[PDB]
């Protein structure tokens, strides 16, 4: 599968689309570390929306379908972006180009052990695959364009759009790893692992109701079951 010119220009548009918070410091500092972490997620949603609006075929879908796609895929894009910023040596994640965050830093931010250990296992397994900017942006696009998300009206067009990024990925990985034909389905098999991680995240959001820790309004409209 050879890379076409219109696949090439689309891939480079996706790379070029990707190119004040609460300070990180008792019961009060426990709330502030949760506030810093949730504001990093607010920033992420804004960057997810801005990236999604530059993907071909996204704004030609209905705004209802756009909301339907972005509500369920936001966490999966966030987990793909967490695995991009993974450090194999220091066992940590770097948010906002300076500060590193390990497993205990995620615990002090208010996350359960049942969520934290599958984040770091996925991120280590993604680091072993050694992905590009182009391979990351394409996998984000495939995850956004899933036809099997809840409340998707035009399922046929979302699936047709997904397959164009799927075969753009296949044609790119044939250039990037020309002696390894397994590298394209390995990246696709990580989207399988993202759905389990999204489901594990649903149990985390449900656990925040049991300890009364409230989400901020942008995060609450996409994640809480009202």
């Amino acid at each position: 599968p050879q890379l076409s010119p219109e696949q090439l220009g689309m891939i480079e548009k996706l790379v070029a689309a990707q190119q004040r918070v609460t300070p990180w410091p008792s019961r009060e500092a426990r709330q502030q570390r949760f506030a810093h972490f949730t504001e990093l997620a607010i920033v992420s949603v804004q960057e997810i929306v801005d990236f999604a609006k530059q993907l071909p075929g996204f704004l030609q879908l209905s705004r209802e379908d756009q909301i339907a796609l972005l509500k369920t895929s936001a966490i999966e894009v966030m987990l793909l972006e967490t695995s991009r910023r993974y450090n194999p040596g220091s066992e940590s994640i770097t948010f906002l180009k300076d500060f590193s965050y390990n497993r205990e830093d995620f615990a002090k931010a208010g996350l359960q052990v049942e969520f934290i250990n599958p984040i770091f296992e996925f991120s280590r397994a993604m680091n072993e695959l050694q992905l590009n900017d182009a391979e990351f942006a394409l996998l984000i696009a495939i995850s956004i364009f899933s036809a099997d998300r809840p409340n998707v009206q035009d399922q046929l067009q979302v699936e047709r759009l997904q397959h164009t990024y799927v075969e753009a990925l296949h044609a790119y990985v044939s250039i990037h790893h020309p002696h390894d034909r397994l590298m394209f389905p390995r990246m696709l098999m990580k989207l399988v692992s993202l759905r389990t991680l999204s489901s594990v995240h649903s149990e985390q959001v449900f656990a925040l109701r049991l300890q009364d820790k409230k989400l901020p309004p942008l995060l609450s409209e996409i994640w809480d079951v009202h």
Partner: peptide
């Protein structure tokens, strides 16, 4: 609709 119960997400998509 999903649009009426996602008002901030709709506002980010319009801006």
């Amino acid at each position: 609709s999903l649009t009426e119960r996602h008002k901030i997400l709709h506002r980010l998509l319009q801006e």
